[PDB]
Amino acid sequence: NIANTLMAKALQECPNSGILWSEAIFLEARPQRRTKSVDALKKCEHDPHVLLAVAKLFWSQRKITKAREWFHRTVKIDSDLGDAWAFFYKFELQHGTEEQQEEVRKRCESAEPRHGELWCAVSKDIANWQKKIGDILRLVAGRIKNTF
Amino acid sequence: AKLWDSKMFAEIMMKIEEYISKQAKASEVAAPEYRVIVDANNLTVEIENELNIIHKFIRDKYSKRFPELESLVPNALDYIRTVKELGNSLDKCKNNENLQQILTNATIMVVSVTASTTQGQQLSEEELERLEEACDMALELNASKHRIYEYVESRMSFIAPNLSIIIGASTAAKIMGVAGGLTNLSKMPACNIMLLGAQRKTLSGFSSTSVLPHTGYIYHSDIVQSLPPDLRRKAARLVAAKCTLAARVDSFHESTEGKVGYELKDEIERKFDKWQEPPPVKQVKPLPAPLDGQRKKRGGRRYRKMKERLGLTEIRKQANRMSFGEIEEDAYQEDLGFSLGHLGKSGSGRVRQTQVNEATKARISKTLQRTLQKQS
Amino acid sequence: DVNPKAYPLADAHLTKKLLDLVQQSCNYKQLRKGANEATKTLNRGISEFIVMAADAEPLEIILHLPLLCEDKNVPYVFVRSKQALGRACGVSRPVIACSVTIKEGSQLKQQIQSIQQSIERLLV
Amino acid sequence: EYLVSPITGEKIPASKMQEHMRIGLLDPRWLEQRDRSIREKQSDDE
Amino acid sequence: LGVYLTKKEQKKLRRQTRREAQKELQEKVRLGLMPPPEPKVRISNLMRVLGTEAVQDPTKVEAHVRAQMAKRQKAHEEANAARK
Amino acid sequence: ALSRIKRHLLTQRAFKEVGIEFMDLYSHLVPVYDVEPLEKITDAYLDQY
Amino acid sequence: NVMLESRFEKMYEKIDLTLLNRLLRLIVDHNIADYMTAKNNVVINYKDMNHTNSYGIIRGLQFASFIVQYYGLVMDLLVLGLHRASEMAGPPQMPNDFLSFQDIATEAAHPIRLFCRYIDRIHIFFRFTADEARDLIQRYLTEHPD
Amino acid sequence: TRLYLKAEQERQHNYLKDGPYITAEEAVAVYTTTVHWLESRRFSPIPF
C-alpha cells in the first residue's frame, strides 16, 4: 500500500515518465490494468516502455497476435531502448514459433541502425550493470569504469 | 516449470493460511477472527491469480492439442474442466454426458464441430501427464475456493451485516471474494461492483442480448432475479448502488445490527414496487368535432417554407398531365398503373428537360440526425 | 457542529470560495459530481481535490473517499450543507461529494492551487 | 439556515430551500392549464 | 451564503421573464396604450412588406426602410451607451 | 455510409425490434418483416457484396 | 426413369443458429458470419406482443436469401452425396452447365441423373436399371413390409 | 396473426428450454460434408 502511495505521488509529480508508468501498470491489479491504467498511459505518452508494457500485458492475457503486433510496433518506434528484445525473445520462445524466435533473435543483432545499444538497453532496464559486466563486454577499459 | 512453481506456492499457502481458516471454522463448529477473515478474503484473490496462471499454462499446453477451445470456452475454470474431460481424446466429443454439466448445449455443439476438423496434433505422454496434474491441482484449488466461500458465507453475519442483509449471503461472499476484500469492495465505484464476476460469454451465433453481457453476480442475486427481464438490468444497477453504500458502511463497522441494511432494503423494495406498479387510469381523448367557418392561420417565413415543401413542383405538375389520343407504352413492368404522363412524352411543350426542384429533397429528421451523430 | 466527525471542515469564509470554484469548474466542465465519479477520477489519477458534504445520514458512504485520497495524495475538504454543494455543482438534487479534474493548460490552475494550499493550511 | 433566493432576493431558510426553488419559478400558465383541465373535466357528460 | 442555480433553472427564469414581457407588450397593445407593432423591414424584406407600394415611388420606400433599420440600430447603440 | 456499414459489421451485435405482419393469400399467411432503415442499408449492402 | 419432386417442409423455421454460424464461417469472414447470425436473432414485434426469435431464421432480412441458398446447398450435399455432387458440378477448374455432364460415363455411373433445388423445391430425376430398382424395392420393403 | 405469434412464442420457449434439436454428431456430419465440398471445389472464403 505504501508502494502504491509512493507510485501515485511519483506519477502526480513526475508525469510523462514511461518507465514509471509501465511499472505502475505492474503495481495495478489485473482487473484494473487494461481497463483504466493502460488507456490513460497511452494517452500520456508513447514511450517504447509504453508499447513494451502493452505487449507484455497482452502476452499475460495470451493475446498472441496482438502482442506480436505491439512488439513489432515497439521495435519500429525505438531500437536498443528499454531492453524489449529480451521480452520479445521470451514471448517467442514461450508463445511464438521456433523459426519466429530465431528470426526475432537475429533481428536483435548489435548494429548501428538496430539494437546498437542492446547491452546498454539491458543495463538501463534489466539492471545489467556490474563490475564484471564491462569486462564481459568488449570495451573493458571504458565501459567497466563508466558503468557500475 | 511455471505449473510446478505455482502448485508449490499454492500448497505452501494452503498448508498455513487455509489450515488456519480450517481451524477457525472448526472452532465454532488473542488472535481474533478478523485476521482470519481478512487472510481468507485475500487468499481468494491469491488462489484466483494462481488459477489464472494455471489456466494460462493449460492453454499454452493444449494449444498444441486444440488451438481453438480458448475462444470457444472463455471461462478459465470451464476451460480446465473441459480439457480434463477431453484430454488428448477428441473423438470423445460425441454425446459426452459429462460435458453437459460443464458446458451449455450451445457450445458443446460448437466444440464438437471444431474438433471434427481441427489441425491440433495429439499430445504425447509427457504433455498428457503434465496437463493432467495441472488440471487436478486446478480443480483442487477450485474446491478450496468453494470451501473458503462457504466459510465467508458463514461469517457474513459478522463481516458485512448490512451488505449481507441487502443481498444474498452467497452473493455477498462471492462479490467480496472477487473484489479482494471488504475494504477493496468498499473503495470501488457503484458502477463497477455490478460488473464483478461478469464472464465474457461468447455469442454462439446468437445476439449479444441473449448472452446478457455486462451482467455480474449482483444481476444474478436473489432479489434481482425476482423481476421481469425488461426490469432486470435497471434493478441490478439500483441494487449495486445500495450494495456499495452497505460496503461503505460495513467497511467502517457501523450499524452492526443492520439498521442501515433495513433502511436500504426497504427503499429498494419501494423502488421495485414503484417500477412494477400498475399503470394509472388515463382517459381517452374524444375525436375532435368537424371544423367549419374560418380559422386564422399566420403567414411568414415558416409558411413560405412549408408551402415550398408541399407545393406542386414543375416536374410533378408535368407528371400528372396525360396526352390525349397518343398512347404510350408502359415502361414499368412491375406495375401498369404508373406512368410519367407528359414527363418524357412527346408534345409536352418542353424542349429542354424539366429540372429537379431541390426544395423537395428528402432529408432525415432532427432526432434521426442526432442518433446518426451518436452512432458515428 | 452537526457532524463532529468531519475534522477537516471548512469555515464559512472558505465555503464561499469553494463553491465559487466548483461552479467555475462546472462552467469549464472540470467537475465530476457524485461519490462514484470522484472515486473513478481518483483511481484514474486525474483529480486534484475532492469537496464533500458533512450532512448524510449514512455518512460513511463518503468516508471511503478520504482514505483513498490519502492513498492517492489528494486533498479533501468537508462542507456543511449538501444542497448548497449541489447547487454549486449545477444540480438541483443534493450532492454529497464532488471532485475537480485536471485538464491540460487549464485556466483555473492558479485558483485550484490556491484552494489546494488552503486545504493543507486547514489540516491540523 | 438562511439563504438568499437567487430569483427573489429574500432571506429564506435552507430546510425549505430546494422546495422554495421548485414552487419559486412555477409558471402561472401551468395554473392556467390546470384550470382549463379541471374545467374540461367538469365539462364532460356521462 | 449566496446560492447558485442550475442551467435548467436559468433557462426557465429567462424564458419566463421574456414571456412576461411579451405578454405585457401584447396586452398593452390590447388596451390601446401602445400602437400596434410595425413589421420589421430590411432590404430583403422590402419587396415582401412594401411590394405593392414600392412600385409607386421606390426611393421613398428605400429611405423609409433604411430609416427604420437605422432607428433600430441607433436604439441599440444608445442603449449600450447609456449602459456604459 | 460505407464506414458506418463496416462499423456495424465489426461491432454491432444487438439490434432494434423488427415488426412482423402477414400477407393473406387466402391459402397461407406469408410473413413480412419490417426492419429499421439504418440496419436495412447495411443488410442490403452485405447481401449485394 | 423415376422423378421425385418435394420440398423441405420447414427449412426456414428449422435452421439452428449455431450450425448456420459455423457453416457461414466456412465461406465468409467470421465477423460477417457472426453479424448475420446475430441479425437473425432479434426481437419480433407485433402490436402489443413480442418474442425473441432464437431458433428460426427471419426471411425478411435482405441477406437472408443468400443464407437460405447456402443452406440449401448443404442440403444438396446430403441428398446428392459429395462424390455425385462433384460428378454433376464437374471439376472446379471446368464446371459444367446447369444440366450437362463431362461425359456419358459419369452420367450413367449413378442413378441420380438430374437434380435442381430452386429455393426449397427439390426436383430429382433418377434412372434405374431393373436390378437396381428391384434391390431398392427389396431394401425398402425389408423395413416396411406391406 | 395473434394465434401464429402465440405458437411461435411457445416454439421459441420450447427450443430454449429443451436446447437445440440438432445433435452434436449430426452437426459434425453436416459440417464435415460442407468442409469436404468446399475443399474439393478449391473455394476461397469471402473476405471482409
Curated annotation (Swiss-Prot), chain A:
Modification after translation: Phosphorylated by PRP4K during spliceosome assembly.
Expression across tissues: Widely expressed.
First and last residues of every HAT repeat: 62-94
Record localization: Nucleus, Nucleoplasm; Nucleus speckle
Medical condition linked: Retinitis pigmentosa 60: A retinal dystrophy belonging to the group of pigmentary retinopathies. Retinitis pigmentosa is characterized by retinal pigment deposits visible on fundus examination and primary loss of rod photoreceptor cells followed by secondary loss of cone photoreceptors. Patients typically have night vision blindness and loss of midperipheral visual field. As their condition progresses, they lose their far peripheral visual field and eventually central vision as well.
Oligomeric form and interacting partners: Identified in the spliceosome B complex. Identified in the spliceosome C complex. Associates with the U5 snRNP particle. Component of the U4/U6-U5 tri-snRNP complex composed of the U4, U6 and U5 snRNAs and at least PRPF3, PRPF4, PRPF6, PRPF8, PRPF31, SNRNP200, TXNL4A, SNRNP40, DDX23, CD2BP2, PPIH, SNU13, EFTUD2, SART1 and USP39, LSm proteins LSm2-8 and Sm proteins. Interacts with ARAF. Interacts with AR and NR3C1, but not ESR1, independently of the presence of hormones. Interacts with USH1G.
UniProt name for this protein: Pre-mRNA-processing factor 6
Source organism: Homo sapiens (Human)
UniProtKB/Swiss-Prot annotation, chain C:
Tissue: Ubiquitous.
Family according to the record: Belongs to the eukaryotic ribosomal protein eL8 family.
Main location: nucleus
Pfam families: Ribosomal_L7Ae
Protein name listed in UniProt: NHP2-like protein 1
PANTHER family given in the database record: RIBOSOMAL PROTEIN L7AE FAMILY MEMBER
Effect on the protein upon substituting residue 53 to F: Abolishes U4 snRNA-binding
GO molecular function: ATPase binding; box C/D sno(s)RNA binding; RNA binding; U3 snoRNA binding; U4 snRNA binding; U4atac snRNA binding
Species annotation: Homo sapiens (Human)
Gene behind this protein: SNU13
Phosphoserine carried by residues: 118
Region (Interaction with U4 snRNA and U4atac snRNA), start-end ranges: 32-44
Residue numbers bearing the N6-acetyllysine modification: 17
Keyword Transcription regulation: no
Gene3D superfamilies membership: 3.30.1330.30
The protein's role, per its UniProt record: Part of the small subunit (SSU) processome, first precursor of the small eukaryotic ribosomal subunit. During the assembly of the SSU processome in the nucleolus, many ribosome biogenesis factors, an RNA chaperone and ribosomal proteins associate with the nascent pre-rRNA and work in concert to generate RNA folding, modifications, rearrangements and cleavage as well as targeted degradation of pre-ribosomal RNA by the RNA exosome. Involved in pre-mRNA splicing as component of the spliceosome. Binds to the 5'-stem-loop of U4 snRNA and thereby contributes to spliceosome assembly.
GO biological process: box C/D snoRNP assembly; maturation of SSU-rRNA; mRNA splicing, via spliceosome; ribosomal small subunit biogenesis; single fertilization
UniProtKB/Swiss-Prot annotation, chain E:
This protein's name: U4/U6 small nuclear ribonucleoprotein Prp3
Residues of the full protein shown: 436 to 519 of 683
Tissue expression pattern: Highly expressed in retina, liver, kidney and blood. Detected at lower levels in heart and brain.
Functional summary from the UniProt entry: Plays a role in pre-mRNA splicing as component of the U4/U6-U5 tri-snRNP complex that is involved in spliceosome assembly, and as component of the precatalytic spliceosome (spliceosome B complex).
Subunit record text: Component of the precatalytic spliceosome (spliceosome B complex). Component of the U4/U6-U5 tri-snRNP complex, a building block of the precatalytic spliceosome (spliceosome B complex). The U4/U6-U5 tri-snRNP complex is composed of the U4, U6 and U5 snRNAs and at least PRPF3, PRPF4, PRPF6, PRPF8, PRPF31, SNRNP200, TXNL4A, SNRNP40, SNRPB, SNRPD1, SNRPD2, SNRPD3, SNRPE, SNRPF, SNRPG, DDX23, CD2BP2, PPIH, SNU13, EFTUD2, SART1 and USP39, plus LSM2, LSM3, LSM4, LSM5, LSM6, LSM7 and LSM8. Interacts directly with PRPF4.
Taxonomic source organism: Homo sapiens
Encoding gene per record: PRPF3
Region Mediates interaction with SART3, annotated ranges: 1-84
Top-level taxon of origin: Eukaryota
Cellular compartments annotated: Nucleus; Nucleus speckle
Posttranslational mods: Ubiquitinated. Undergoes 'Lys-63'-linked polyubiquitination by PRPF19 and deubiquitination by USP4. 'Lys-63'-linked ubiquitination increases the affinity for PRPF8 and may regulate the assembly of the U4/U6-U5 tri-snRNP complex.
UniProtKB/Swiss-Prot annotation, chain H:
Function comment: Plays a role in pre-mRNA splicing as core component of precatalytic, catalytic and postcatalytic spliceosomal complexes, both of the predominant U2-type spliceosome and the minor U12-type spliceosome. Functions as a scaffold that mediates the ordered assembly of spliceosomal proteins and snRNAs. Required for the assembly of the U4/U6-U5 tri-snRNP complex, a building block of the spliceosome. Functions as a scaffold that positions spliceosomal U2, U5 and U6 snRNAs at splice sites on pre-mRNA substrates, so that splicing can occur. Interacts with both the 5' and the 3' splice site.
Record protein name field: Pre-mRNA-processing-splicing factor 8
Domain characteristics, as noted in the entry: The MPN (JAB/Mov34) domain mediates interaction with TSSC4 and SNRNP200. Has structural similarity with deubiquitinating enzymes, but lacks the residues that would bind the catalytic metal ion. Contains a region with structural similarity to reverse transcriptase, presenting the classical thumb, fingers and palm architecture, but lacks enzyme activity, since the essential metal-binding residues are not conserved.
Organism encoding this protein: Homo sapiens
Paired cysteines (S-S): none
Localization of this protein: Nucleus; Nucleus speckle
Tissue expression notes: Widely expressed.
Highest rank taxon of the organism: Eukaryota
